[PDB]
């Protein structure tokens, strides 16, 4: 089927993120017909370097911070009654779900 | 009176400032972070940044 919805997941804790996928595809393979498999996008890597000292003097050393971002996406063929049901399934940790209504 | 704030700042390094320390030298303009360098390194972890390499 009726609507063609799409769900997206961005987060950092991979284990939390790979978990909720397993949870949602379980309920989808539970009560549905045919959905998708997780399309794994390449990670992003934010990278910053600084001088490790506040002042200027010293020996010339550096530091390199970063953070990775992990991203996934899936779609379903069904009426939107289902998405209002299964977007409530205990998605506690830092995990951004972003979901479209029909193909967008 | 009218000549108080007459200077058209609008650009440069005497326009921006570290949001927290209210400083002007050594800023970071990447991802709207707009933060003094020492100040960034200080916190740098609630933000989620860490270092592995």
């Amino acid at each position: 089927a009726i609507h063609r919805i799409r769900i997206t997941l961005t987060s950092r804790n991979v284990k939390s993120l790979e978990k909720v996928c397993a949870d949602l595809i379980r309920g989808a393979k539970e009560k549905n017909l045919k959905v998708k498999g997780p399309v794994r996008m390449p990670t992003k890597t934010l990278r910053i370097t600084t001088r490790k000292t506040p002042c200027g003097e010293g020996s010339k050393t550096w530091d390199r911070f970063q953070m990775r971002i992990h991203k996934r996406l899936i779609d379903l063929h069904s009426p939107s009654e289902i998405v209002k049901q299964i977007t409530s399934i205990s998605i506690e940790p830092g995990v951004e779900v972003e979901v479209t209504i029909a193909d967008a | 009176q009218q000549l108080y704030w007459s200077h058209p700042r609008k650009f440069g390094q005497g326009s921006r400032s570290c949001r927290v320390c209210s400083n002007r030298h050594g800023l970071i303009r990447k991802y709207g972070l707009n933060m003094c360098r020492q100040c960034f390194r200080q916190y740098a972890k609630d933000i989620g940044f860490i270092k592995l390499d």
Partner: peptide
Amino acid sequence: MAVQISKKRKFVADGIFKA
């Protein structure tokens, strides 16, 4: 968001919030 900002700039400001 409303301004349709990148996911990069999003997570960052989400941290600046908590600080």
